[PDB]
Each structure stands twice: as structure tokens, then as C-alpha cells.
């Protein structure tokens, strides 16, 4: 599942026993109930540009 279109994940993808897929997030992010989206949990998450994010 992960090999194709990142398994639908916004960030990290883990394949499981069967056609089971868990999306994961980098530190400073949490997974939303859609199970694919990552939302920041900190003021300065990695890979985001504050001056652009505040626009």
C-alpha cells in the first residue's frame, strides 16, 4: 500500500500483516482521525516556514 501514492499518508507510512496500513507523523505533529493527515502540536514544527504559515 505504502509503495503507491505514499499509502495516502501526508507523512510516514507503515505496511502491516495484510492490507493494513498505519500513517505516522514526524515529532511535533499528530495524526488526525482521517488517519492520513498530520497537524502541528508545537509552535515551530520541522519543515514549515513561519513567515509563510502566518500569511
Amino acid at each position: 500500500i505504502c509503495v503507491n501514492e505514499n499509502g495516502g499518508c501526508e507523512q510516514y507510512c507503515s505496511d502491516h500483516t495484510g492490507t493494513k496500513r498505519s500513517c505516522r507523523c514526524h515529532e511535533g505533529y499528530s495524526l488526525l482521525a482521517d488517519g492520513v493527515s498530520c497537524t502541528p502540536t508545537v509552535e515551530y514544527p520541522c519543515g514549515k516556514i513561519p513567515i509563510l504559515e502566518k500569511r
Binding site: 505514499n6 507523512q11 514526524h26 509552535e43 520541522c46 519543515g47 516556514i49 513561519p50 513567515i51
Partner: protein, 251 residues
């Protein structure tokens, strides 16, 4: 950077400036508050290890605006497989003496997971390369941080599209242009090759080498960071060691 533009202030917040005795040495990428990834070849000619400084929040070299944060480099970690004066395994992991403070001008770049980097990030065509390197071949270096958008090539196309030539290993990748108009240069060494994916930027490459600055028939060569994720992660979890330079087994 040849043929780029001035990165607007705060738009490359993970860019590191490395200094030796106050002189411009290399670039780097902040990946959290205490760790910077750069190129191993940046440290080939260092003798004064205690004079290594990392500057975060830097933009314009002629002015202090208060957003700059300077830190002593407590440790430089290089793979055992890297040989000074050569191209392969061109990566360094730097531990700052004290954490940097995250602000609008100082933000880490995401060091991605290997699988995600190999199966997803490797297929994003364009990525950003940055530094205060030379603006032209045999020209002066930049006073303001420059950025360039470069396309990544499959290693087969790099070889057939190019004109005593060093090989391109599984620990490298080509990115850029063959017409001599746009390139990363030697003063950009160690800087980030950053890839955007679904609203977030990730570290995919390190400015490593080439066959002359913006040379016709030749592409930029970047360290393939995906090959070092595990090596980097294991070292970030390890206790500091006496001495500035550390050679660490690779893999």
C-alpha cells in the same frame, strides 16, 4: 549559487552558515535544536577544531539584525567510509554546544524516514538548494542567502546526459542543469537540498561536488541523505564523546 535568486529573509529558516575563525566555510541544515547536517569534505582542511561556529537565522552577511544565533560546534561526526580528498560518503553530523532557540527565523528541516524518502521524496522532480556560495564560476560569493530550484535526475540519465571523471555512487544523486546557467557551487558545500511534499519540507540531499561551477554538460552532485537516516538517528541518541572530530562506523 549560480542563476538563483535571493531567498527572502526567514524563507530558508533551517539554513546554517559554518565559520572557521570568522571566515565563511560551508553551509549546513538544522534538523532539530542541537543537530546540523553538513558535508564531510568541509572539514578536510580544519586544524583549529575549537574555532568552528554554526550561525542560524542568518540572511545578510554585512549586517547583524538580531535574528542570528551563533553556537560552538561541540562535535563533528563523519562516516568511517569517507576518505578525505574524495567524493563518496560526503556527510557530517554536527552537535552544537548549546541548543539553538526556535523562532520565526530558526526552524529545523525534517530529516525524513528512509522508506518515505526512497519511495516518495526521490520522485519529487524539483527541490531547493541554497547557500552564500559563489554567484558565478571564478566570481565573488553572495552577501545575501541565495536559493535555486533544481530538477533531480535518475542516475542513468545523469551519466548519458553528461559530457578523469569521478563515478556517481548509490550514496549520491544528480540535480540541476547542463547548460551552465544554474548550479550550486563549492561555497554552497554542505548546504540543504530540500524537497516539498504535502505542505512540509524534508532533507533529501547535501551540496557535495561537481566538475567545476556551472560547467556546460555537467550536473551538481548531492549526497543521498536517505542512505544515512539510520546512521544519523543512532548517533543523535548517543552520548557526546571527548574530542571534536569523531569517525563513526558506516553502516
Amino acid at each position: 549559487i549560480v542563476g538563483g535568486k535571493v531567498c527572502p529573509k526567514g524563507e530558508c529558516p533551517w539554513q546554517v552558515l559554518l565559520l572557521v575563525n570568522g571566515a565563511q566555510l560551508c553551509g549546513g541544515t538544522l534538523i532539530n535544536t542541537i543537530w546540523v547536517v553538513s558535508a564531510a569534505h568541509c572539514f578536510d582542511k580544519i586544524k583549529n577544531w575549537r574555532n568552528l561556529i554554526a550561525v542560524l537565522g542568518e540572511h545578510d552577511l554585512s549586517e547583524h539584525d538580531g535574528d542570528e544565533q551563533s553556537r560552538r560546534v561541540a562535535q563533528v561526526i563523519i562516516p568511517s567510509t569517507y576518505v578525505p580528498g574524495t567524493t563518496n560518503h560526503d556527510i557530517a553530523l554536527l552537535r552544537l554546544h548549546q541548543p539553538v532557540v526556535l523562532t520565526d527565523h530558526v526552524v529545523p528541516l525534517c530529516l525524513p524516514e528512509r522508506t518515505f524518502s526512497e519511495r516518495t521524496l526521490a520522485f519529487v522532480r524539483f527541490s531547493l538548494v541554497s547557500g552564500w556560495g559563489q554567484l558565478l564560476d571564478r566570481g565573488a560569493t553572495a552577501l545575501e542567502l541565495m536559493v535555486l530550484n533544481v530538477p533531480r535526475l535518475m542516475t542513468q540519465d545523469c551519466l548519458q546526459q553528461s559530457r578523469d571523471s569521478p563515478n556517481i555512487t548509490e550514496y549520491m544523486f544528480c540535480a540541476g542543469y547542463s547548460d551552465g546557467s544554474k548550479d550550486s557551487c563549492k561555497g554552497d558545500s554542505g548546504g540543504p537540498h530540500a524537497t516539498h511534499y504535502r505542505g512540509t519540507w524534508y532533507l533529501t540531499g547535501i551540496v557535495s561536488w561537481g566538475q567545476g561551477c556551472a560547467t556546460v554538460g555537467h550536473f551538481g552532485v548531492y549526497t543521498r541523505v536517505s542512505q544515512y537516516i539510520e546512521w544519523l538517528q543512532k548517533l543523535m541518541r548517543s552520548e557526546p564523546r571527548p574530542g571534536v572530530l569523531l569517525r563513526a562506523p558506516f553502516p
